[PDB]
Design a binder for this molecule. Sequence first.
Ligand SMILES: NC(=O)C1CC=CN([C@@H]2O[C@H](COP(=O)(O)OP(=O)(O)OC[C@H]3O[C@@H](n4cnc5c(N)ncnc54)[C@H](O)[C@@H]3O)[C@@H](O)[C@H]2O)C1
Ligand SMILES: CCCCCC(=O)N1C[C@@H](C)c2c1cc(O)c1ccccc21
Ligand SMILES: [Mg+2]
Ligand SMILES: [Mg+2]
Ligand SMILES: [Mg+2]
Ligand SMILES: [Mg+2]
Lengths: 494, 494, 494, 494
Amino acid sequence: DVPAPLTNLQFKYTKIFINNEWHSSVSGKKFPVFNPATEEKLCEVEEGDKEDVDKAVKAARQAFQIGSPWRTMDASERGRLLNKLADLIERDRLLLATMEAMNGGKLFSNAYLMDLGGCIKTLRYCAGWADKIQGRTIPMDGNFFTYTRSEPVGVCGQIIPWNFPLLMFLWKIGPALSCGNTVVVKPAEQTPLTALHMGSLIKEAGFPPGVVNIVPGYGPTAGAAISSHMDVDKVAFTGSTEVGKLIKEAAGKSNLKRVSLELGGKSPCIVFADADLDNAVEFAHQGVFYHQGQCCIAASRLFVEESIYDEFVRRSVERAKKYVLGNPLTPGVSQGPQIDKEQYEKILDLIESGKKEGAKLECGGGPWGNKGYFIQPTVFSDVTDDMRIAKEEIFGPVQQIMKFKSLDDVIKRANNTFYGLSAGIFTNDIDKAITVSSALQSGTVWVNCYSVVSAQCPFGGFKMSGNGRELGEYGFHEYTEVKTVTIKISQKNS
Amino acid sequence: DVPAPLTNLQFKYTKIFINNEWHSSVSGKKFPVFNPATEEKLCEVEEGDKEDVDKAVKAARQAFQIGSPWRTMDASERGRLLNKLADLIERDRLLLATMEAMNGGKLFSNAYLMDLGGCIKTLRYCAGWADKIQGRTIPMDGNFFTYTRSEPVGVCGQIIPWNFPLLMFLWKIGPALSCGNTVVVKPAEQTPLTALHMGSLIKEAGFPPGVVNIVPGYGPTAGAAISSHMDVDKVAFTGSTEVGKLIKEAAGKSNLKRVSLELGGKSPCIVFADADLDNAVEFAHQGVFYHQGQCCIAASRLFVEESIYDEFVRRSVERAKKYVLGNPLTPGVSQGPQIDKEQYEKILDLIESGKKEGAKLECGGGPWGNKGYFIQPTVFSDVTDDMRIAKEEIFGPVQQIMKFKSLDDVIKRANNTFYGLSAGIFTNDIDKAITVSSALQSGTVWVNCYSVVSAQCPFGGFKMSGNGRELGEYGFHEYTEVKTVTIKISQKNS
Amino acid sequence: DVPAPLTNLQFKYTKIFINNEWHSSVSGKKFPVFNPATEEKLCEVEEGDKEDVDKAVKAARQAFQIGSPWRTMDASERGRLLNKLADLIERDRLLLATMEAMNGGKLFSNAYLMDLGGCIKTLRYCAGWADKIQGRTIPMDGNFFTYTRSEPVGVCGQIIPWNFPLLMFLWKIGPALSCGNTVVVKPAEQTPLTALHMGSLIKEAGFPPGVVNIVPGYGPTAGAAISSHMDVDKVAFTGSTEVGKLIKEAAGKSNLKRVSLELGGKSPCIVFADADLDNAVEFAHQGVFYHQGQCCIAASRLFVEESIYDEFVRRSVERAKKYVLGNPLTPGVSQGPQIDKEQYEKILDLIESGKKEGAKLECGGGPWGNKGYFIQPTVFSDVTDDMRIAKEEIFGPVQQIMKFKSLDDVIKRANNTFYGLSAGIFTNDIDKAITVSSALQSGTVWVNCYSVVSAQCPFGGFKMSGNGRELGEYGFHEYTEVKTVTIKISQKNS
Amino acid sequence: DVPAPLTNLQFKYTKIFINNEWHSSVSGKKFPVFNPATEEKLCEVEEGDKEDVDKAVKAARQAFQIGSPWRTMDASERGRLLNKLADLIERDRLLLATMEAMNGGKLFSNAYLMDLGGCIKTLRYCAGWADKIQGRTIPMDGNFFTYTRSEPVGVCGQIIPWNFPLLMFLWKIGPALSCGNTVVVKPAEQTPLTALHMGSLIKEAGFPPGVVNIVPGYGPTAGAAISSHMDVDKVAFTGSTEVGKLIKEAAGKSNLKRVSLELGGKSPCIVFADADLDNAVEFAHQGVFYHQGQCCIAASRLFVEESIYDEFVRRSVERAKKYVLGNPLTPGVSQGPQIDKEQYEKILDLIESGKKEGAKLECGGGPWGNKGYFIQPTVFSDVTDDMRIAKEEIFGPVQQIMKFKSLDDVIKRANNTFYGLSAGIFTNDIDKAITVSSALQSGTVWVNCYSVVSAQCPFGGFKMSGNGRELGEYGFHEYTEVKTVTIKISQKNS
Ligand SMILES: NC(=O)C1CC=CN([C@@H]2O[C@H](COP(=O)(O)OP(=O)(O)OC[C@H]3O[C@@H](n4cnc5c(N)ncnc54)[C@H](O)[C@@H]3O)[C@@H](O)[C@H]2O)C1
Ligand SMILES: CCCCCC(=O)N1C[C@@H](C)c2c1cc(O)c1ccccc21
Ligand SMILES: [Mg+2]
Ligand SMILES: [Mg+2]
Ligand SMILES: [Mg+2]
Ligand SMILES: [Mg+2]
């Protein structure tokens, strides 16, 4: 069960982390970090920019040199180190979860049970792959012995968002380290604090200097320095589709670095008339409203078959009114604030567009309170595909409900988007479960559930929701570069 | 199009096949081979025994020596040779299918469409794996470079039954050759003829001598010579459970040769009340009656939920009366004879036990015609678990129908047998499909179908229905012997 | 046997290939295609541009729709169709090899033995993977059944160069088709002719319309239409590093399409004093001069240990003087022309830079003949790392020889380039073979050989020599898009 | 560095372990356990027999039932439990290592550094595979969705020897538990004590009752009860070739249970004239004399090329005289006793046969001391292939040195044995390293080293040295049973 959050949080790790030391920014500038529930400043953090990135990339390159400790270390030992890191996150779990709740506007019990539990499980999963990343021996033509090495890619720039700050930090470093790479991470400017605490734990677990470097700062400065850097071998980014395009173009213009992207979505959740309604209502509701709707996988287009549509709407509206808004550290609060003013305004503007374009406002639809970025949970019905709320990622607590009559029609409508991160299907019919899931152009498809993410599974997007997969067996091979070695011999035998 | 069968077949390949030559038996003895529909002798074949097997094993060992053509040949070339073999089977498809129909008591159209098509597809599948059987490179502890080789096992003895003589011959040689082994095949005494034709095609395709050797003859003579042989590395057997036990014990007493077994069954087919009855009735019917019930996977315990049981019985009985018995080469005939007198009598005896022990005879139940081993298609209802017909593999056209009320009860009853080759489930419920299939102790579980066998799928038994898998990715690695090579180096890098 | 080439080739396939039909260009324009040995026009070809590409992408999308013949076809059948295609290439092997020799300036005997043999082997390899591309089932946390599908990516745009026109066409289509994709291929403007013949064979083998579409034309027109296209899921490119950058940036600006690139090189070949000199001299010589030096993998920096350097130079110079230049269809000719005027001039310019910057001209160094783009085989010694000939890809018959004393120095010098496609090591020492190959930042490393490329091996570049691998097991999974399907169940069992 | 051993060892776990409780033997009998260095009784242990085995198998079957805690537990959690077990072995390392040294006649510092370190590393390796054992989804022919489950095999009987009692216990349970099986382990009657202490740790780590059951006792009683048991799904055995034959025959006669065997060896170590002699002398020496020669992989035929043979002999004899015999807990002692009187006598008898058959005794050759089973380290030269010491596994500190002149001759001689566990090659030549290792019929082949065993590598024997592999990726799939599930659907798409 869940301890009381800390309150009197004193901050200690506020600097740039390079070669297991803490540096001031080269410019000397700092930037403030705020609690979105109260709008109060938590602390100031060193403002990393291009010159700080260059120092970090240099440290990461040195630590990846042939003969260095990280390169010559047993793979089994990289595994041990990743597990020791997980142990230290268990020790510091109350601190981290408190810190994440304060900085990210996140409900404490969720930060403590879901995010932190996830952080630990991800690292344990990663630790186990370290010495199980293998190459091949290949029966090629002619008198040769041929094998492949699954080498690390090298220096990996890793740029991450503010919605699950610590979990996303570990989704990046875990697999990269497991495969033997070195990294330069750029936490979101809104949420650098848990990442910086992780720096102290990295050094304490015993990772060689240079293996993890962490540069807080802004996007078009520190972020763009990473994507354009001539000595970064690979960039991995989770964020907005818009910035993902800039990353890919920067990668092409500079040194053709490898790119993986996870870009958000407009995921459809399809409820057929033969489905278990109770189960479907709850999963679809959580699917869209979790963490104030700030999930990449939000079930933000809910298609419900005509014969059950009015009932589904009624039950969804009723479910959406059971929230207590407030400070996410306060017991009884069940909905926190949006992350910052930019997102707050983006959401209100999209809610306004829904009213304007004729969607039916069923509940909520405006701000709440007079401190922090709170929006009432909002449901819209009679949404049609041409509306802004049906096409654009809102990233706030706003559900769209739409009706359909035909199986073929709803598949087409589900697929009619540049997005493809995830999808949900609710049905009792075997054939529909298998065939509809095959037809949906989405990287994860849930049947009779939603938002089920686990470290064993590959995760990522079709189309403009992403390139590559993370986690699972398939994610790990993304953090390797394959080398083929072919050795002439006098005579080959099978 | 199914062509007209040949008649008046002249036989040519009647000898023992060793080093791509045809040999008389060492003893000089021959044995007769019959058409079971007519009881007429087709021809005589050289009778292989221990001394013939020894010659065949010597050939197979020589052809497997380091530096030999078959060991030094490109893996891709083993692939090409398997495909060329498939091309020759297409060329000779009418001859082979006729020959199989005559020698095996098999319906011609099925021999031509299913068996021969199967033969060609199996070989094409196998051909493609040849140069895709790969080892690993392994990030082991310490300053070493380590790799594995997936070598062939070596000389493989392969003993096969009379129900699908040609298909089973290719299920054995295809994967063994693909992986680079040499073999000594022992066709069933009832059905040596298509196998011996295959000898001519093997030579004609261009396989080096010694790579396939074929020894017709009896079980406790030629068959047991193989299982006890001190220079056979591996035995693979398809047949009766009883003989499978002898194979395994002979393997232990002699040289600890590797063993794989496929041993027949008493497969349950479970029909829940929520199933599509039309689909279920036909699949369950074919599932038990195909090839005069002479299928290892026969759906020989049909469990039907209480509420639909009487209707299921009525429809199954009605379906079982639509057969025309006779010579399987004659158009219009839809049921041929049992393979020989021993099986004929085994079946009549088991039918008699069903009457005696109180099962309800719904139709058939006795012999037919005045030449050849024909048995009327027989259905028994109100079968209970203690009866001989519910426990023993009958291997004839005899269906058992049983009722159940409880989900847990039927899973337990399904699993309550030493057999475990296959099982069928018929339901419209997603949860039942997944969970019941997980709970059944059977190697292949079909959902809303039955008897669907394909070269891409691993196939074989739980419990006393087998050891190992055949075909698919998994089958192939069981025709390899893994070697680990570990090389000291001055310094390892990831 | 190498047959006599054809002469007086009559051309038939000169159009744009879409939905298994031949189309005029939308503009009506045509462009000429030349024989580079004679400078004579061979024929004119329809000039594809953006509007043609759009038609081709529409066809490829339609053929990829759920329920279409190519999507519902058995994977094994995609395999059979690829093999049938290989059979037709064998039938048409003299025509194709002649055609390639005429259009590409390629030595006929090499076109007939190496390129065409390669073409056939690549397709056979690909055919075999089709029904062996598999997903996973995953023991994820919680009460779920989870599996992955290895789906095709979808519509793949494929842009290819003029050095191995037919081989590169099949390296692209073979794996894409094996995995179930549809494609739009853009042959190099210099060399469209064998590709267009392949169109006729594709139709004749029985591929559904829309599965391969082929658009001849120029780069910044047709090529750039492909890379910017909003409905192309993936672009695959082989060519110059410069254009590769444009492809990657276009992919980012447009629809974030997946990208794979193979970009040429400046591959080092390192000869240690303990090496077999005879073997090393010949491999290094072929390694740089093959196909008039127009190989991506050309061994264009030859590092030779100080103690054997002068002898290595002497023997290399002697080897480089044994060529007869002329028309590559004429018996006895052992060196054909460069592909076109642009390359011709690029090479002469780089040769001139070598003289200017102080390298020692050992032989050749200027043009030959009075028609067609012939350059004398040229060797430079005392080359140092700062020279243009040591840094830039020359793509002509020009060898650079350089000396080294230290193991560490030469590894560093080898790696000091933005390129990383391949490398060669020549030594008798086990430790050097393993450790030096691990240290070289190159995608393929040869030990005591060079230029050994086979369909079973993954192939591609480190750093700015590429992204992704082609062929082998690894190449195939890069023509798949992974989908995770997670189904809620009542209770999971292991 | 190495703590002082404990001395005053009080024993606590002396009983049979079933369902996480301690039971008296059903008969009430106990058997004594001795310290081989002193011949003193350490304690008495409950004597398990057939009826105790039956209780253990019943517990293991119950704990493997569908819906049981072990079956429904997350795979990731099986991993956590295996790591927690490793942590408890780290806590109890001094106790365990002391206990192993006392009971097994093992040098304490080796028990503490090598065996215990190995125990821990094995478990960590296993723990990581738990949630990475995956099945497949398969693009089979026709309108079906097909997947496989890698299920556990079920109840696994595991019979182990006295040479590495704890390490062998964990080599068995680690992989079996990781894959989700339940076990019944039968420790060697000489060395039950560390295994029984492991019982307490299993219960303390939190494994459900019935998952590990441990039955001490004799071979033909408790051992044979396991191999013949009608409800054991699989037997895994490490021991004598003779008993391995009995296991395989019992498996066939009873219920056709799956069998894996690791059976000892007569491994050849080949030193070519071009090898590094210093390195070779030491590795070959350790390779045969480690743990008083009681290693399955002992380098017990040392082939040395003629030109370096006399020098190799001289240096090997000199190396063999640097031992201090005595109590293995006493500092300065570098050779302990043989395990018991039976082995002691077997070794003296084989040493006698060497003298008798004409081998040249270079040093040692008789007993030492007057308490405990000590044999002087013995070297024999001029050994020829017909001698008993060249053919039979001695399992004592006895090295055989033999000469060879020809490469082909020495490969033949190396392979001329029913054994094939391991082999060593010492050479500076690349071609020899690769080709000779390919030609040797041995499951592990070391190049320029020996006895390098790591958890990432598959381990086991060719021919009569074993069936199956342990550890590595390949070992784990041996503890799974594959199930294929095929589900009819309306229409399949790629
Ligand atoms: N998929 C998801 O989970 C989502 C998560 C969050 C928002 N998602 C979506 O994006 C919108 C805007 O949020 P923002 O916060 O602006 O995201 P950005 O994509 O900008 O922030 C992502 C990271 O990129 C760094 N960054 C910014 N500009 C950069 C540049 N030019 N070069 C390099 N880097 C740059 C930046 O500092 C941060 O660390 C949200 O409303 C969501 O729709 C989806
Ligand atoms: C959106 C539906 C709510 C489900 C709650 C949840 O665990 N979510 C919801 C959603 C925001 C999400 C998680 C968990 C993670 O591990 C995630 C990891 C990566 C991306 C999103 C994640
Ligand atoms: Mg932004
Ligand atoms: Mg019999
Ligand atoms: Mg250009
Ligand atoms: Mg014994």
